[PDB]
Design a protein around this ligand. Sequence first.
Ligand SMILES: [Cu+2]
Length: 214
Amino acid sequence: HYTFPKVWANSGTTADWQYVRRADNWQNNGFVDNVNSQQIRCFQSTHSPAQSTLSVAAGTTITYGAAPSVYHPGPMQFYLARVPDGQDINSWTGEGAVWFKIYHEQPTFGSQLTWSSNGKSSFPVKIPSCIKSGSYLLRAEHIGLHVAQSSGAAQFYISCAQLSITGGGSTEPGANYKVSFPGAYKASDPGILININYPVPTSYKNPGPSVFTC
Ligand SMILES: [Cu+2]
Protein backbone atom coordinates (compact mmCIF):
# COMPACT_ATOMS: atom_id res chain seq x y z
CA HIS A 1 0.00 0.00 0.00
CA TYR A 2 1.64 3.16 -1.35
CA THR A 3 0.94 5.98 -3.75
CA PHE A 4 3.26 7.57 -6.31
CA PRO A 5 2.30 11.19 -5.67
CA LYS A 6 5.35 13.23 -6.75
CA VAL A 7 7.87 13.73 -9.48
CA TRP A 8 10.74 16.18 -9.49
CA ALA A 9 13.89 17.18 -11.28
CA ASN A 10 16.57 19.67 -10.16
CA SER A 11 14.66 22.34 -8.20
CA GLY A 12 13.75 20.57 -4.96
CA THR A 13 10.59 18.49 -4.41
CA THR A 14 7.14 19.42 -5.61
CA ALA A 15 3.84 18.96 -3.74
CA ASP A 16 1.76 15.78 -3.71
CA TRP A 17 -0.29 15.57 -6.92
CA GLN A 18 1.18 18.81 -8.27
CA TYR A 19 2.64 17.28 -11.45
CA VAL A 20 1.00 13.88 -10.95
CA ARG A 21 -2.65 13.29 -11.85
CA ARG A 22 -4.36 12.49 -8.58
CA ALA A 23 -4.68 8.71 -8.42
CA ASP A 24 -7.87 7.11 -7.21
CA ASN A 25 -5.88 5.50 -4.33
CA TRP A 26 -5.01 8.88 -2.83
CA GLN A 27 -6.98 8.06 0.36
CA ASN A 28 -6.51 4.30 0.81
CA ASN A 29 -3.04 3.74 -0.70
CA GLY A 30 -4.53 0.67 -2.38
CA PHE A 31 -4.10 -1.07 -5.69
CA VAL A 32 -5.60 -1.91 -9.05
CA ASP A 33 -6.05 -5.67 -9.57
CA ASN A 34 -8.04 -5.41 -12.82
CA VAL A 35 -5.80 -5.25 -15.90
CA ASN A 36 -8.98 -4.49 -17.94
CA SER A 37 -9.93 -1.39 -15.96
CA GLN A 38 -9.33 2.17 -17.12
CA GLN A 39 -7.54 2.47 -13.77
CA ILE A 40 -4.67 0.31 -15.11
CA ARG A 41 -3.57 3.31 -17.16
CA CYS A 42 -3.26 6.26 -14.73
CA PHE A 43 -5.41 5.02 -11.81
CA GLN A 44 -8.30 7.34 -12.74
CA SER A 45 -11.78 6.10 -13.50
CA THR A 46 -12.66 9.77 -14.11
CA HIS A 47 -9.84 11.64 -15.87
CA SER A 48 -8.56 14.66 -13.93
CA PRO A 49 -5.50 16.69 -15.03
CA ALA A 50 -2.53 17.38 -12.80
CA GLN A 51 -2.24 20.91 -11.45
CA SER A 52 0.92 21.55 -13.47
CA THR A 53 3.30 20.04 -16.04
CA LEU A 54 7.00 19.60 -15.26
CA SER A 55 9.64 20.71 -17.78
CA VAL A 56 12.52 18.23 -18.15
CA ALA A 57 15.31 17.83 -20.69
CA ALA A 58 15.46 14.61 -22.69
CA GLY A 59 18.47 12.55 -21.66
CA THR A 60 18.30 13.52 -17.98
CA THR A 61 17.19 11.63 -14.89
CA ILE A 62 14.27 12.77 -12.79
CA THR A 63 12.83 11.29 -9.64
CA TYR A 64 9.44 9.62 -9.07
CA GLY A 65 8.44 9.49 -5.42
CA ALA A 66 6.45 6.88 -3.48
CA ALA A 67 4.58 7.32 -0.22
CA PRO A 68 5.38 5.48 2.02
CA SER A 69 8.34 3.42 0.76
CA VAL A 70 7.67 0.50 -1.56
CA TYR A 71 7.56 -2.72 0.46
CA HIS A 72 5.76 -5.40 -1.55
CA PRO A 73 7.97 -7.63 -3.72
CA GLY A 74 7.91 -7.06 -7.45
CA PRO A 75 8.99 -4.78 -10.28
CA MET A 76 8.85 -1.08 -10.89
CA GLN A 77 8.13 -0.21 -14.52
CA PHE A 78 7.90 3.16 -16.29
CA TYR A 79 6.29 4.14 -19.58
CA LEU A 80 6.04 7.32 -21.63
CA ALA A 81 3.31 8.49 -24.01
CA ARG A 82 3.64 11.56 -26.19
CA VAL A 83 0.70 13.93 -26.42
CA PRO A 84 -0.14 14.59 -30.12
CA ASP A 85 0.75 17.95 -31.58
CA GLY A 86 -2.12 20.37 -31.09
CA GLN A 87 -3.62 18.52 -28.13
CA ASP A 88 -3.42 19.94 -24.62
CA ILE A 89 -1.80 17.58 -22.13
CA ASN A 90 -4.38 18.49 -19.45
CA SER A 91 -7.13 17.02 -21.60
CA TRP A 92 -5.26 14.00 -23.02
CA THR A 93 -6.02 10.64 -21.39
CA GLY A 94 -3.47 8.55 -23.32
CA GLU A 95 -5.81 6.14 -25.07
CA GLY A 96 -4.71 3.88 -27.90
CA ALA A 97 -1.34 2.29 -28.57
CA VAL A 98 0.77 5.20 -27.39
CA TRP A 99 2.73 3.94 -24.37
CA PHE A 100 6.33 2.78 -24.65
CA LYS A 101 8.33 1.27 -21.83
CA ILE A 102 11.49 3.05 -20.73
CA TYR A 103 12.37 0.91 -17.70
CA HIS A 104 11.50 -2.37 -16.06
CA GLU A 105 12.97 -4.02 -12.99
CA GLN A 106 14.52 -7.48 -12.93
CA PRO A 107 14.89 -9.24 -9.57
CA THR A 108 18.06 -10.81 -8.30
CA PHE A 109 17.72 -14.59 -8.48
CA GLY A 110 18.68 -16.48 -5.37
CA SER A 111 17.04 -18.64 -2.72
CA GLN A 112 14.29 -16.05 -3.02
CA LEU A 113 13.75 -13.24 -5.48
CA THR A 114 15.05 -9.95 -4.12
CA TRP A 115 13.94 -6.64 -5.55
CA SER A 116 15.97 -3.44 -5.51
CA SER A 117 12.70 -1.52 -5.25
CA ASN A 118 12.26 -2.89 -1.72
CA GLY A 119 12.42 -0.10 0.83
CA LYS A 120 12.79 2.64 -1.77
CA SER A 121 10.97 5.96 -1.33
CA SER A 122 11.80 7.26 -4.79
CA PHE A 123 13.15 6.08 -8.14
CA PRO A 124 15.47 7.63 -10.71
CA VAL A 125 13.84 7.63 -14.12
CA LYS A 126 16.14 8.12 -17.08
CA ILE A 127 14.40 9.93 -19.92
CA PRO A 128 15.73 8.78 -23.33
CA SER A 129 17.85 11.40 -25.12
CA CYS A 130 16.59 10.61 -28.58
CA ILE A 131 12.81 10.92 -28.31
CA LYS A 132 10.91 13.85 -29.82
CA SER A 133 10.36 16.95 -27.69
CA GLY A 134 6.78 17.55 -26.64
CA SER A 135 4.30 17.01 -23.84
CA TYR A 136 4.28 13.53 -22.32
CA LEU A 137 2.64 11.38 -19.70
CA LEU A 138 5.01 9.35 -17.53
CA ARG A 139 3.28 6.30 -16.08
CA ALA A 140 4.73 4.77 -12.90
CA GLU A 141 3.78 1.32 -11.73
CA HIS A 142 4.84 -1.05 -9.04
CA ILE A 143 3.54 -4.60 -9.38
CA GLY A 144 3.24 -6.34 -6.00
CA LEU A 145 3.55 -10.07 -6.59
CA HIS A 146 3.51 -11.59 -3.10
CA VAL A 147 0.13 -13.34 -3.62
CA ALA A 148 0.06 -13.28 -7.43
CA GLN A 149 -0.27 -17.03 -8.02
CA SER A 150 -4.04 -16.52 -8.33
CA SER A 151 -5.74 -14.70 -11.18
CA GLY A 152 -6.52 -11.11 -10.28
CA ALA A 153 -4.18 -11.13 -7.26
CA ALA A 154 -1.26 -9.03 -8.56
CA GLN A 155 -1.37 -5.57 -6.99
CA PHE A 156 -0.70 -2.61 -9.30
CA TYR A 157 0.23 0.72 -7.66
CA ILE A 158 0.05 3.38 -10.39
CA SER A 159 0.13 7.06 -11.20
CA CYS A 160 0.88 9.34 -14.15
CA ALA A 161 2.90 12.54 -14.30
CA GLN A 162 2.57 15.40 -16.78
CA LEU A 163 5.87 16.38 -18.40
CA SER A 164 7.10 18.81 -21.01
CA ILE A 165 10.18 17.12 -22.48
CA THR A 166 12.62 19.50 -24.15
CA GLY A 167 15.74 19.17 -26.29
CA GLY A 168 14.68 15.96 -27.94
CA GLY A 169 16.05 13.93 -30.80
CA SER A 170 14.30 12.34 -33.76
CA THR A 171 13.88 8.69 -32.70
CA GLU A 172 10.31 7.38 -32.79
CA PRO A 173 9.74 4.16 -30.85
CA GLY A 174 8.55 1.44 -33.22
CA ALA A 175 5.02 0.05 -33.37
CA ASN A 176 6.26 -3.04 -31.53
CA TYR A 177 7.22 -0.84 -28.59
CA LYS A 178 3.90 0.96 -28.21
CA VAL A 179 0.99 -0.49 -26.29
CA SER A 180 -2.33 0.57 -24.80
CA PHE A 181 -3.62 0.65 -21.23
CA PRO A 182 -5.85 -1.24 -20.80
CA GLY A 183 -4.70 -3.73 -23.44
CA ALA A 184 -1.03 -4.40 -22.80
CA TYR A 185 -1.59 -6.80 -19.92
CA LYS A 186 -3.60 -9.96 -19.45
CA ALA A 187 -4.33 -11.63 -16.12
CA SER A 188 -2.59 -14.79 -17.41
CA ASP A 189 0.67 -13.08 -18.35
CA PRO A 190 3.61 -15.00 -16.83
CA GLY A 191 4.92 -11.99 -14.90
CA ILE A 192 1.45 -11.23 -13.48
CA LEU A 193 0.11 -14.74 -12.75
CA ILE A 194 3.11 -16.09 -10.90
CA ASN A 195 4.16 -17.83 -7.72
CA ILE A 196 7.31 -15.98 -6.64
CA ASN A 197 7.63 -17.90 -3.42
CA TYR A 198 8.33 -21.66 -3.62
CA PRO A 199 9.49 -23.21 -5.81
CA VAL A 200 11.28 -19.98 -6.49
CA PRO A 201 11.36 -18.88 -10.09
CA THR A 202 14.77 -18.72 -11.75
CA SER A 203 13.62 -16.16 -14.31
CA TYR A 204 11.01 -13.39 -14.46
CA LYS A 205 9.16 -12.17 -17.54
CA ASN A 206 8.12 -8.56 -17.00
CA PRO A 207 4.70 -7.85 -18.47
CA GLY A 208 4.38 -5.50 -21.39
CA PRO A 209 6.59 -4.60 -24.35
CA SER A 210 10.33 -4.49 -24.65
CA VAL A 211 12.23 -1.58 -23.08
CA PHE A 212 12.88 1.14 -25.60
CA THR A 213 16.42 2.55 -25.67
CA CYS A 214 18.15 4.90 -28.07
CU1 LIG B 1 -0.17 -3.06 0.08
